[PDB]
Paper text:
To probe the global structural similarities between the MK-D1 and eukaryotic Sec61/OST/TRAP translocons, we constructed the AF2 predicted models of MK-D1 Sec61, OST and TRAP complexes and superimposed them onto the eukaryotic Sec61/OST/TRAP translocon cryo-electron microscopy (cryoEM) structure. We were particularly intrigued by the cytoplasmic C-terminal domain of OST1, which forms a cytoplasmic helical bundle in the MK-D1 model and in the eukaryotic structure (circled). Finally, to ascertain whether this cytoplasmic domain of MK-D1 OST1 can interact with ribosomes, we produced histidine-tagged domains from MK-D1 and human OST1 and carried out pulldowns on nickel-nitrilotriacetic acid (NTA) beads against HeLa cell lysate, and semi-purified and highly purified human ribosomes. Ribosomes were detected to bind to the human and MK-D1 cytoplasmic C-terminal domains of OST1, but not to the negative control, the MK-D1 OST1 extracellular N-terminal domains. The C-terminal domains of OST1 were able to recruit ribosomes from samples with different levels of ribosome purity, indicating a direct and specific interaction. This finding suggests that MK-D1 OST1 participates in the recruitment of MK-D1 ribosomes to the Sec61/OST/TRAP translocon at the cell membrane for translation and translocation of membrane proteins and preproteins. A comparison of the surface residues of the human and MK-D1 cytoplasmic C-terminal domains of OST1 reveals surface patches of basic residues that cluster in regions that may be able to interact with the RNA components of the ribosome. Here, we show that the cytoplasmic C-terminal domain of archaea OST1 also mediates interactions with the ribosome, and specifically, the MK-D1 OST1 complex can engage human ribosomes, despite the ∼1.8 BY of divergence of the two species. Furthermore, we show that the cytoplasmic domain of Candidatus Prometheoarchaeum syntrophicum strain MK-D1 oligosaccharyltransferase 1 (ribophorin I) can interact with eukaryotic ribosomes.
In the Sec61/OST/TRAP translocon, the TRAP complex aids ribosome docking to the Sec61 translocon and participates in protein folding, while the OST complex mediates N-linked glycosylation. Phylogenetic analyses indicate the inheritance of eukaryotic Sec61/oligosaccharyltransferase/translocon-associated protein translocon subunits from an Asgard archaea ancestor.
Numbering used by the authors: 466 to 607
Write the structure that this text describes.
C-alpha cells in the first residue's frame, strides 16, 4: 500500500537534503567568485557533508519501508536518487569545461558556448525534475 507514517517523515527529510545540496552549490559559487576564504569553504562544505551523511543515515529505515512498497513511490525515489547524482555529474562537467576552455584546449568559442549553455540547461532540467518529484511525494500528504 502506501505507508503514510514513513512517507510523512521522508518528505521532510528529502526537502532538507535538497536544501543543503543547494547550499553546497552556493558555497561552490562563492568560492569561484572568490567571495569567501577557502578556509571557510572547506570548513563549511565538510560541515554540510556531515549533515547530509547524518540525514541520509536517518532516512534509511523510512526509505527502505517506502521502496519495499514497489509501484509508483519506489519509482519516484529511484528517480530522485538518479537525478541527484546526475546534477552532481553536470556540476563537475561544467567546472572541467571551464578549465579546458581557459587553457585554450577547446575547438572554438562557438563550441564552448553551445556546450556550456547545454550544461546550464541540464542543471535547471535536473533540479526541475527533483522539485517535481518531491512535490509528487508531498501530494500524498497535503
Amino acid at each position: 500500500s502506501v505507508p503514510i507514517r514513513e512517507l510523512t517523515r521522508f518528505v521532510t527529510l528529502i526537502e532538507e537534503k535538497n536544501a543543503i545540496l543547494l547550499d553546497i552549490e552556493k558555497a561552490d559559487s562563492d568560492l569561484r567568485r572568490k567571495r569567501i576564504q577557502k578556509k571557510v569553504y572547506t570548513k563549511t562544505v565538510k560541515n554540510y557533508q556531515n549533515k547530509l551523511k547524518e540525514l541520509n543515515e536517518e532516512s534509511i529505515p523510512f526509505k527502505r519501508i517506502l521502496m519495499e512498497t514497489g509501484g509508483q513511490i519506489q519509482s519516484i525515489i529511484q528517480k530522485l536518487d538518479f537525478l541527484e547524482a546526475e546534477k552532481i555529474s553536470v556540476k563537475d562537467s561544467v567546472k572541467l569545461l571551464k578549465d579546458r576552455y581557459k587553457r585554450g584546449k577547446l575547438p572554438s568559442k562557438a563550441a564552448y558556448e553551445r556546450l556550456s549553455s547545454d550544461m546550464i540547461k541540464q542543471l535547471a532540467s535536473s533540479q526541475n525534475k527533483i522539485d517535481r518529484y518531491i512535490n509528487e511525494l508531498r501530494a500524498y500528504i497535503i
